[model samples]
Target: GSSGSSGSPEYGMPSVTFGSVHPSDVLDMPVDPNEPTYCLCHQVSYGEMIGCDNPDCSIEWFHFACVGLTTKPRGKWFCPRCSQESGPSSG
Candidate 1:
């Protein structure tokens, strides 16, 4: 969803889609709160479910890299479109 810069290429990155997990779908066992959760974006697990920081947005489960943050504390986590606009300042 990035708008290309004047000289940047026009190819768009594919949007990430996560597999559906219904509320009724129960796990074999209860997951520990202390354990890391798996991120559908990077396919890497994380220990927390950091919600998107946009006041009007409600997305959650974003990975560190997906939001363009070095660590959980670096930047306000946002979805692809919001992240690509106006650099990192929008989030």
Candidate 2:
């Protein structure tokens, strides 16, 4: 069984991805597994994200593109979760 040729291991993965980080390390975690697993739109993190401070909604972090934003938010912001949780005072 000694084939002396160089070979690369086939893997069920890739390189340089957020997928590599532990969700607990990168996300709030202990999260509801049945709820939104990642962003509200896509099921993962691609770029900069905004965390909905609202306590009622399940969305932990909202991507810039998910909620239909032209550019990244400048000041404080909130999702519909905000209205349901904190009204106009969402942190």
Candidate 3:
């Protein structure tokens, strides 16, 4: 699971990866405020997203298409904040 670089994503739990999705992919790019850009994964005009069910998590939604996810995950969904337990994601 190591990417041979400290800049890769870190997660104790197993996650998904498809297409060209890289561990370094992020959701920090600025977008239109009028439009909903809630996914903390990738930037896309793809309509709709799924919200995390973890009550402790503050994330409202996530993209399922851009990153190549299929059905909605049946269990708790952890955002970058929920997993890292830190202030904002890093480069």
Local accuracy of candidate 3 as per-residue lDDT tens digits, 23-66: 66667888665664557754543555656666766555677764
- Candidate 1 per-residue lDDT, tens place, 1-91, comes to 6675556556666777667655676669876656544455545455544656676664445675555555565356565645566655554
Off by over 4 Å in 3: 1-33, 41-48, 66-68, 84-91
What is candidate 1's local distance difference test score? 0.58
- Of 1 and 2, the candidate ahead on TM-score is 2
For every candidate, C-alpha RMSD to the true structure in Å? 24.3, 19.6, 26.7
Task: Return the clash pairs for model 2, or none.
Answer: none
- Highest lDDT among the candidates is held by which one? 2
Where does candidate 1 clash, by residue pair?
Answer: none
The TM-score of predicted model 2 comes to: 0.38
Off by over 4 Å in 1: 1-45, 83-91
| Residue 8 miss distance in model 2 (angstroms) | 61
lDDT of each: 0.58, 0.63, 0.59
Kindly report the root-mean-square deviation of model 3 from the true structure over all alpha carbons. 26.7
